[PDB]
CSV table of C-alpha atoms in Angstrom, one decimal:
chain,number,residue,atom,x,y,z
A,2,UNK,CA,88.2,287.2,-5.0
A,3,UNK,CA,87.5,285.9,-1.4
A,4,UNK,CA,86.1,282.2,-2.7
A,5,UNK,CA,89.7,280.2,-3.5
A,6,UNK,CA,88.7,276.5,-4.5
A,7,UNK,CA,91.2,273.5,-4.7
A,8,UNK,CA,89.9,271.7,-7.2
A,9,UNK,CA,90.4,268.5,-9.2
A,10,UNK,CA,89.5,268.5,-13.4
A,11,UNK,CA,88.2,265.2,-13.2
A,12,UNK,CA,86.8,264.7,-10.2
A,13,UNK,CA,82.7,264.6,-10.0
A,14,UNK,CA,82.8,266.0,-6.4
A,15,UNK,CA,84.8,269.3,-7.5
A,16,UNK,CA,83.2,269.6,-11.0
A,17,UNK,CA,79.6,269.7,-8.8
A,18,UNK,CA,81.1,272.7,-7.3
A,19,UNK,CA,82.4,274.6,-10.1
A,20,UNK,CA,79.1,273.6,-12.2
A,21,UNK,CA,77.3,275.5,-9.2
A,22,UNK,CA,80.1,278.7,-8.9
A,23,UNK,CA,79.4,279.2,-12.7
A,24,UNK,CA,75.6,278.9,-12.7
A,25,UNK,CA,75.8,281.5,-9.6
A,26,UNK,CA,78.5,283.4,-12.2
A,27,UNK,CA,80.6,284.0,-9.0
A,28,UNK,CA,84.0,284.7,-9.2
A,29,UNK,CA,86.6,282.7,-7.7
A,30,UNK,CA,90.2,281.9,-8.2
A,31,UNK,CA,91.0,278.1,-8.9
A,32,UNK,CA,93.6,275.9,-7.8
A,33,UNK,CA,93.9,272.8,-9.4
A,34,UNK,CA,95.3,269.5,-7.1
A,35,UNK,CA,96.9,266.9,-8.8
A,36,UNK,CA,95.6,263.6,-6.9
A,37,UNK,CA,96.6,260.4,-8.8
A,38,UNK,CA,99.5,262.1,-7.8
A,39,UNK,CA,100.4,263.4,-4.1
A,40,UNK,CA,99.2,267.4,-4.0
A,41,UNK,CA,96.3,266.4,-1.5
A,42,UNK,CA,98.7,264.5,0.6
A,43,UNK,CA,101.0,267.4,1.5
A,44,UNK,CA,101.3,268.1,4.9
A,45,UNK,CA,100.4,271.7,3.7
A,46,UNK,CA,97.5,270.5,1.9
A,47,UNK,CA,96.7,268.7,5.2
A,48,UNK,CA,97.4,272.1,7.0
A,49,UNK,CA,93.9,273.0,5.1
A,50,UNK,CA,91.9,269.8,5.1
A,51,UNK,CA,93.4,266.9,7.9
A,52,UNK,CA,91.0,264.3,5.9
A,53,UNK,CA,93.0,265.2,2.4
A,54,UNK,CA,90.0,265.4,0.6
A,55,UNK,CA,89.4,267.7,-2.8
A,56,UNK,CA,87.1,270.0,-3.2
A,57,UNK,CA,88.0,272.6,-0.7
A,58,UNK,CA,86.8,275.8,-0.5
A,59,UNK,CA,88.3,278.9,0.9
A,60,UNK,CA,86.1,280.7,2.3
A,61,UNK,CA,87.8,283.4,5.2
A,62,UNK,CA,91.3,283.8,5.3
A,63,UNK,CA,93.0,280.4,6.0
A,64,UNK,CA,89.3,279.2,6.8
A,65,UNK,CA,88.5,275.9,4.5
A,66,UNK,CA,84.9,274.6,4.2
A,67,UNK,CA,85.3,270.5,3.0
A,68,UNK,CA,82.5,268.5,1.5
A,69,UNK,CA,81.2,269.4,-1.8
A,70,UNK,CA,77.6,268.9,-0.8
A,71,UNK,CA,78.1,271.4,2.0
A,72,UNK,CA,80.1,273.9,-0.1
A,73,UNK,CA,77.5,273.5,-2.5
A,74,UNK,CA,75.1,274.7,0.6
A,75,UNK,CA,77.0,277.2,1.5
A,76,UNK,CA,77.7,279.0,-1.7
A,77,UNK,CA,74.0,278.6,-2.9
A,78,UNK,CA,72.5,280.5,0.6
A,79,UNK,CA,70.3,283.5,-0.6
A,80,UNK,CA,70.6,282.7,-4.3
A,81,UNK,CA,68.5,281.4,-6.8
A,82,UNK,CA,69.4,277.8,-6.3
A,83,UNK,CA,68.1,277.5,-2.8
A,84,UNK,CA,64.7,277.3,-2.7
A,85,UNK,CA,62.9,279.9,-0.3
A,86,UNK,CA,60.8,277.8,2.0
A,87,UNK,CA,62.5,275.8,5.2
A,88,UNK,CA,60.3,272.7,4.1
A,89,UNK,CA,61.6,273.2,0.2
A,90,UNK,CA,65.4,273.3,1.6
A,91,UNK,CA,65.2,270.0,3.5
A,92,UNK,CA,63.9,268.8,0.4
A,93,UNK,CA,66.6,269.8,-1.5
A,94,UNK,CA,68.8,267.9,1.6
A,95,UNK,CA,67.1,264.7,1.3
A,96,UNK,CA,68.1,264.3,-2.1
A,97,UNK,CA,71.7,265.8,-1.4
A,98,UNK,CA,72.2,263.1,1.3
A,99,UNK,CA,70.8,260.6,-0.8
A,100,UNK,CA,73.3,261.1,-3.4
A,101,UNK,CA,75.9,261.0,-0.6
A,102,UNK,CA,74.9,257.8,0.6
A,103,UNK,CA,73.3,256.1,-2.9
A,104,UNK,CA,75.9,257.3,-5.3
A,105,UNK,CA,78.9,258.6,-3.9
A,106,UNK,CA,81.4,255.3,-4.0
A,128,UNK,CA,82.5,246.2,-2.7
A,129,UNK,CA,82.5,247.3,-6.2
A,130,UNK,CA,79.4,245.6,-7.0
A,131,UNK,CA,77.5,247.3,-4.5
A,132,UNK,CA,78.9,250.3,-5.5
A,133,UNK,CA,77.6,249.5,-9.3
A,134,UNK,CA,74.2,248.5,-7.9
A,135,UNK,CA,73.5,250.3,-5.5
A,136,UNK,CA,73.9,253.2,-8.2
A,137,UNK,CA,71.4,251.7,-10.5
A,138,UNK,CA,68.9,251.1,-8.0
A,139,UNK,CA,69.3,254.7,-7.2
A,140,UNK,CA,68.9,255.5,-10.5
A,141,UNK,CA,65.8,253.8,-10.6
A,142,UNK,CA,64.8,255.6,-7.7
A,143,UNK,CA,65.6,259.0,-9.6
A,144,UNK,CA,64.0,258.0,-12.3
A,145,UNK,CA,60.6,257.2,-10.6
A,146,UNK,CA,60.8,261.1,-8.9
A,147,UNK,CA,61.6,262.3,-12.4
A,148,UNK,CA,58.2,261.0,-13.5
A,149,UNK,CA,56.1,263.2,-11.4
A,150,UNK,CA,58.4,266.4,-11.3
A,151,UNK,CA,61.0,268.3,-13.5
A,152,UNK,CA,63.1,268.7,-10.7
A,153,UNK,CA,64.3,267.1,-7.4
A,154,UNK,CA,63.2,269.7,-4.7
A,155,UNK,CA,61.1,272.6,-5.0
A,156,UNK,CA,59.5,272.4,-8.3
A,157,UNK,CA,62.8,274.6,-9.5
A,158,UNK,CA,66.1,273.8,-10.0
A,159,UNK,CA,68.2,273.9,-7.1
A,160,UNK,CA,71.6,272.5,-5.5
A,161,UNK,CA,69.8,269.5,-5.0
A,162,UNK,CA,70.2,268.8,-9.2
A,163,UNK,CA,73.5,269.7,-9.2
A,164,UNK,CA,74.8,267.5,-6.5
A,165,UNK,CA,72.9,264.7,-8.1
A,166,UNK,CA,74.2,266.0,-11.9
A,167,UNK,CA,78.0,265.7,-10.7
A,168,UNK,CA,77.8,262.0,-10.8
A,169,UNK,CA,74.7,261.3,-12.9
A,170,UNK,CA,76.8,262.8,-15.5
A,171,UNK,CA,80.3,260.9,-15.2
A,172,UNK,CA,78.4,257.6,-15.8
A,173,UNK,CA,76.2,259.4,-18.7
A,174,UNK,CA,80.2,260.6,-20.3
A,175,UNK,CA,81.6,257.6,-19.7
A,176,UNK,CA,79.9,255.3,-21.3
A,177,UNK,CA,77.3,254.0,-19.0
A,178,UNK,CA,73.8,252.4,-20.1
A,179,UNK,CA,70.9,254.8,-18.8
A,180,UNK,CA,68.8,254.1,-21.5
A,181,UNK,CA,66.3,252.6,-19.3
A,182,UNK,CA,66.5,255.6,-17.6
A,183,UNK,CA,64.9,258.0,-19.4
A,184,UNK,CA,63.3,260.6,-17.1
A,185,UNK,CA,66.7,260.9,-15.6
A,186,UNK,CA,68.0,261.3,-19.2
A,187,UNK,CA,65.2,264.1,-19.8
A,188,UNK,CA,66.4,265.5,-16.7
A,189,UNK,CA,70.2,265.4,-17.5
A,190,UNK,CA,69.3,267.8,-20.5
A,191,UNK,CA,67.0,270.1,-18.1
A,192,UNK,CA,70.2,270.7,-16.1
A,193,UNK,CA,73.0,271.2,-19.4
A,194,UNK,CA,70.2,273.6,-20.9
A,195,UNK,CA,70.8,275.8,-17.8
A,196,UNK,CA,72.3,279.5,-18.5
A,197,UNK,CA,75.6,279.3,-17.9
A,198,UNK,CA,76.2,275.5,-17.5
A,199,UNK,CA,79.4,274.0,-18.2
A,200,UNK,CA,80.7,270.7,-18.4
A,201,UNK,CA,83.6,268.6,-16.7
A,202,UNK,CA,85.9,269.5,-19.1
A,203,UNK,CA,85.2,272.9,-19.2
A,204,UNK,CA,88.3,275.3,-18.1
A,205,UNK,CA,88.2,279.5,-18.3
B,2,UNK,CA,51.4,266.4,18.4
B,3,UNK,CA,53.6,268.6,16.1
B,4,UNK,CA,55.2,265.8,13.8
B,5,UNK,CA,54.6,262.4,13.1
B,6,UNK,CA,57.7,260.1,13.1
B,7,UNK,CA,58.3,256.5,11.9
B,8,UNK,CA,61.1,255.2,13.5
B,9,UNK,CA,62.5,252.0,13.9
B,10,UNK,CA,63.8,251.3,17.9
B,11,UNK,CA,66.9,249.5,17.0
B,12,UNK,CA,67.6,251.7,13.9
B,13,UNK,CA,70.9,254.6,14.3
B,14,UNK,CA,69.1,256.8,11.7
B,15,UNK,CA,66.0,256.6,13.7
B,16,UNK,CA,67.7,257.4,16.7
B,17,UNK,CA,69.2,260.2,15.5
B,18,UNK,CA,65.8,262.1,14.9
B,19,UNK,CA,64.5,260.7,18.2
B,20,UNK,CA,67.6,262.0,20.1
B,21,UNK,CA,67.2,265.8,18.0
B,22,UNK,CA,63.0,265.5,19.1
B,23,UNK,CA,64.2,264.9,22.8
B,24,UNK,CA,66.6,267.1,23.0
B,25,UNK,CA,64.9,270.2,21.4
B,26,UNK,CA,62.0,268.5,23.6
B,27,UNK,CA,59.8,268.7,20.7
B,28,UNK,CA,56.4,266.8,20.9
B,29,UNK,CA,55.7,263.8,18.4
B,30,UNK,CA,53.9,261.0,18.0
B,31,UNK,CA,56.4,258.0,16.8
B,32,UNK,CA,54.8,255.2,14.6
B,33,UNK,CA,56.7,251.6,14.7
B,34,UNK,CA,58.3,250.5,11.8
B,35,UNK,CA,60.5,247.4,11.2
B,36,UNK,CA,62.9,247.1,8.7
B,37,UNK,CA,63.9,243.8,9.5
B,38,UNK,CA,60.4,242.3,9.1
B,39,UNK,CA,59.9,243.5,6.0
B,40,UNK,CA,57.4,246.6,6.8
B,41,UNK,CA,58.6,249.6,5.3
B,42,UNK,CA,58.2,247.8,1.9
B,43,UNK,CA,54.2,247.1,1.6
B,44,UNK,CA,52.1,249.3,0.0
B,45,UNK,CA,50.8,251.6,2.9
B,46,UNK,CA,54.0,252.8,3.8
B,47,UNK,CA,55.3,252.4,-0.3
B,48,UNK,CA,53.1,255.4,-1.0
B,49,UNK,CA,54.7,258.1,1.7
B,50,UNK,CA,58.1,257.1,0.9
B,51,UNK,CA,58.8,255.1,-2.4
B,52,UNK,CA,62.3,253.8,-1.7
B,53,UNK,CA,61.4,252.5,1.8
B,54,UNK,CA,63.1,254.5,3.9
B,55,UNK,CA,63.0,254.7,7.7
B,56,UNK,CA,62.8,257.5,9.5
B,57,UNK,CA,60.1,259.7,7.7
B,58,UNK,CA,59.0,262.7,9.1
B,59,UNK,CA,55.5,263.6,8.1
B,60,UNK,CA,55.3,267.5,8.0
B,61,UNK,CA,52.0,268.2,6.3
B,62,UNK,CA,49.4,266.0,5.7
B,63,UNK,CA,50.6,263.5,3.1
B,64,UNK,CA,54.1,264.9,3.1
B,65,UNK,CA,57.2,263.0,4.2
B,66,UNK,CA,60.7,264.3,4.7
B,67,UNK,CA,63.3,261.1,4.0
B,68,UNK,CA,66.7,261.1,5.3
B,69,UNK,CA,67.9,261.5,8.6
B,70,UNK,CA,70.1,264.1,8.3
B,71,UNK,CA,67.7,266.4,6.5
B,72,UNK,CA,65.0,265.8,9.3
B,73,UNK,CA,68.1,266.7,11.8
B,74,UNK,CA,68.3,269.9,9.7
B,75,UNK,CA,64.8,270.5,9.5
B,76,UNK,CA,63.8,270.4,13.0
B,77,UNK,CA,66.9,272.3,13.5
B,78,UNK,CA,66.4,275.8,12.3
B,79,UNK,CA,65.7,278.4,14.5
B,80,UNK,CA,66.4,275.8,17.8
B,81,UNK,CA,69.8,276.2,19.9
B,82,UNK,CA,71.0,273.4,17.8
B,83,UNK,CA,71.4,275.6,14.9
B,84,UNK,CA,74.4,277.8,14.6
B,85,UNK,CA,74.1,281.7,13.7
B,86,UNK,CA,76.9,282.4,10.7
B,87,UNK,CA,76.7,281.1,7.4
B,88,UNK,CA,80.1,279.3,7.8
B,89,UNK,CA,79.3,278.0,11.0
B,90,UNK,CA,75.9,276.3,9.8
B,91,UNK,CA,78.0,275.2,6.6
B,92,UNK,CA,80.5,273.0,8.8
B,93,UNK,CA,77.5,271.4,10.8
B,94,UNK,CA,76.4,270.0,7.3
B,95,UNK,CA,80.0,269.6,6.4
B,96,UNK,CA,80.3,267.1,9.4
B,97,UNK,CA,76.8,265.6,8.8
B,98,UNK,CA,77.4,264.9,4.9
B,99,UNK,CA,80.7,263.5,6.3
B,100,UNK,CA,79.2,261.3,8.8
B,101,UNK,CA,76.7,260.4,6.0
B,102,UNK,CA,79.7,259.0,3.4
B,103,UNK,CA,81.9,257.8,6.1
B,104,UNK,CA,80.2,256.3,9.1
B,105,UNK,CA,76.8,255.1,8.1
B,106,UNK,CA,78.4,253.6,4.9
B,107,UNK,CA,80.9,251.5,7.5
B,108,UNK,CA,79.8,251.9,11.1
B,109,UNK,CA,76.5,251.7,10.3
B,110,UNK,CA,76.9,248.4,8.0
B,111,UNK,CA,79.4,247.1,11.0
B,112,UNK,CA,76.2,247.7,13.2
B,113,UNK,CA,73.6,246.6,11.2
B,114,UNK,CA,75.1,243.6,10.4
B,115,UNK,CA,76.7,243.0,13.2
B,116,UNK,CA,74.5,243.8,15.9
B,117,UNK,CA,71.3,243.9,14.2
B,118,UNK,CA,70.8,241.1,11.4
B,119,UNK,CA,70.5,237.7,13.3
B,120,UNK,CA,73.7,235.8,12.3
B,121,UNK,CA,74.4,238.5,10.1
B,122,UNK,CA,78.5,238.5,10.2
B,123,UNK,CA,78.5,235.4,8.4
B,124,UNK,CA,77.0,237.0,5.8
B,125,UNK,CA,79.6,240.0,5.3
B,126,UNK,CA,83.0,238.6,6.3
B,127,UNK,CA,84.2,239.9,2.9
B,128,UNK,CA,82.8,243.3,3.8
B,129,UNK,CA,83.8,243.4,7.4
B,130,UNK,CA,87.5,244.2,7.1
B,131,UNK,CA,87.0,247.6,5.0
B,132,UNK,CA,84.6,248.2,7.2
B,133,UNK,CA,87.1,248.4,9.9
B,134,UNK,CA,89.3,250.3,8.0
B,135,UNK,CA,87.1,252.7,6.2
B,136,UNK,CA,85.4,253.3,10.3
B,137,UNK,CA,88.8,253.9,11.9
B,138,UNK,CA,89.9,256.4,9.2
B,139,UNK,CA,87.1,258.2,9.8
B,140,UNK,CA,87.2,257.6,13.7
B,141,UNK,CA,90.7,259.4,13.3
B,142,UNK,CA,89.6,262.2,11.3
B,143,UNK,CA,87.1,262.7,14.4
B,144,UNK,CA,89.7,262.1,17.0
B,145,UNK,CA,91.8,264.7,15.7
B,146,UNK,CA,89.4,267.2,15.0
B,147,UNK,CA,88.4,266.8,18.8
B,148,UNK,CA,91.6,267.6,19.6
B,149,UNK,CA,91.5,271.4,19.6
B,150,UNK,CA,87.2,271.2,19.8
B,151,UNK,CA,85.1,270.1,21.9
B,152,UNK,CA,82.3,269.9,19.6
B,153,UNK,CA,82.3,269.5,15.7
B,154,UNK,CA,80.7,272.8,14.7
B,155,UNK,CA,80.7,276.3,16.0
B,156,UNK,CA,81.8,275.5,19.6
B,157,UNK,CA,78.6,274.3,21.1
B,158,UNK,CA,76.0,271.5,20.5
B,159,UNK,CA,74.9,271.3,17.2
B,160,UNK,CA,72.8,269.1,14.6
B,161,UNK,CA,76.1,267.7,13.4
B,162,UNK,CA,77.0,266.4,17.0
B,163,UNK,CA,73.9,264.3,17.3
B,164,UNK,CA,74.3,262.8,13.8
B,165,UNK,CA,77.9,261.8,14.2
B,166,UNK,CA,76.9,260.6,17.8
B,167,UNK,CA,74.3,257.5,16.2
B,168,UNK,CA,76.8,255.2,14.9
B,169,UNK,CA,79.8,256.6,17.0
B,170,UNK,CA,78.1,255.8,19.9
B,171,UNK,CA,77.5,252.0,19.2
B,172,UNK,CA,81.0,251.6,17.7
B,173,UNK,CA,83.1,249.4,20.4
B,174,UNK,CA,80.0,247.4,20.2
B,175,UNK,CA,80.6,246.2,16.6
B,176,UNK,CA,84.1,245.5,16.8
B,177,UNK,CA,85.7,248.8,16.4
B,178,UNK,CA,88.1,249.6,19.7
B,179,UNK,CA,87.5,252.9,21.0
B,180,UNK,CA,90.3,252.6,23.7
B,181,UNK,CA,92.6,254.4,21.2
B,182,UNK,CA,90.3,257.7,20.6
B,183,UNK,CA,89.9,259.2,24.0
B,184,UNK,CA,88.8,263.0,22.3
B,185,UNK,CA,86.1,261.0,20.8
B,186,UNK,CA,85.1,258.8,24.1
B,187,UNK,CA,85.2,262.8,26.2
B,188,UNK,CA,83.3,264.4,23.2
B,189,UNK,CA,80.5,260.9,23.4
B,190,UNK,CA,80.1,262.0,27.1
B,191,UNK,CA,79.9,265.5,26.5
B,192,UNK,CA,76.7,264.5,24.4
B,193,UNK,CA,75.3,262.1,26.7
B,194,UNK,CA,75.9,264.8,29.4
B,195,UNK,CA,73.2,267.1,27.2
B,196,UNK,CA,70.1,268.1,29.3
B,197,UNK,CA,67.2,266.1,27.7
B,198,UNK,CA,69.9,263.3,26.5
B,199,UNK,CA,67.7,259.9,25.5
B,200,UNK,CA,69.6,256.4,25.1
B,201,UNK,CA,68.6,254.3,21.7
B,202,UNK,CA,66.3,252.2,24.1
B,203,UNK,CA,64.0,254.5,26.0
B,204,UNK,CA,60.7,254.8,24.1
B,205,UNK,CA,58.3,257.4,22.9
């Protein structure tokens, strides 16, 4: 359409991204990078994104904006999932850099530092039905992307259960889809 | 005046806000807190931000803004330190949710630990040499962005700038070896070089 997106299927990074394309129903042509193989290793792939890193979007012609969280921002700006006021929008950035620093991935750390920020989730989730704004915004969806791949594989959250509540808020969405999901 | 800020000194999150507030020479009025002795975890502070975290910007009365980066971005809008296009503000916070997954998570441990924690290597030598790979792979992906820009977003001083610049900036003094990055040491003096530029030591 313009909006090209390498992509990975299993990747909670790129699935954030198309969750948010197909909540925003925007149009955009897919490319699918095999990592776990060598497609984000290329040289030409590295023509794109010199870090190697999946999901990419394209934005201009040969112009590539990296970072889900960012791409996220960008593709949510005067929609429905960015909140109108400039304190509501940092809002929605605390809890996007949050999740970049609390749950993006020594493994032990990893593991706990994810359940105290689910803990941390969980007491927000409490008070409020959403992370930022008292709406849904790219703030849930950067936070569902990884919430999600421990809730589908196989991780305990029952103690969790404002975050659980809040898992179903997000899947109950118009026009959600899930990891799996392809056109 | 404007804002409230609590701010640790020694802190490279902290300093980041402190370095925006300078810079866009915006008036505050810093409150002390540190980390290290325990004091963002009592109850006082507890109840403005629940998960302890250091720097909070108080906007309103009785509400805090967590998170370094979004304080960057909130003090941001509308200043010189915000670029104009959509794409352009978009690779700012494409640089800051970068430094935010790959400098804090291994400078910044490097530096805490390291530099900040009394006799705190002893107590990460498992962590430390990831640390120093996970730092120089990201010290790289800086050096060669620097290499055709002179700043990391839209051509001119930005948000993004000032929040790569907190850990950067303390690097060589944790045990990373900046000789090797010379786009990254011209692009640390092109920010120190900033009209308004504060070091992490001068105080509010």
């Amino acid at each position: 359409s313009l909006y090209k997106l390498y992509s990975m299927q299993r990747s909670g990074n790129s699935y954030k991204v198309r969750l948010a394309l197909a909540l925003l129903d925007a149009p955009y042509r897919a490319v699918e990078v095999d990592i776990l193989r060598g497609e984000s290793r290329t040289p030409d792939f590295l023509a794109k994104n010199p870090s190697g890193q999946v999901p990419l979007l394209e934005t201009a012609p040969g112009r590539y904006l990296a970072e889900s969280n960012a791409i996220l921002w960008y593709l949510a700006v005067g929609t429905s999932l960015a909140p109108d006021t400039r304190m509501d929008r940092a809002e929605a950035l605390q809890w996007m850099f949050f999740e970049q620093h609390a749950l993006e991935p020594a493994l032990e750390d990893w593991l706990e530092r994810g359940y105290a920020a689910l803990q941390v989730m969980e007491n927000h989730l409490k008070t409020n039905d959403y992370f930022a704004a008292g709406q849904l915004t790219i703030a849930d969806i950067a936070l569902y992307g990884y919430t999600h791949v421990a809730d589908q594989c196989d991780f305990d959250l029952s103690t969790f259960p404002a975050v659980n509540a809040w898992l179903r808020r997000v899947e109950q969405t118009p026009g959600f889809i899930t990891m799996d999901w392809t056109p």
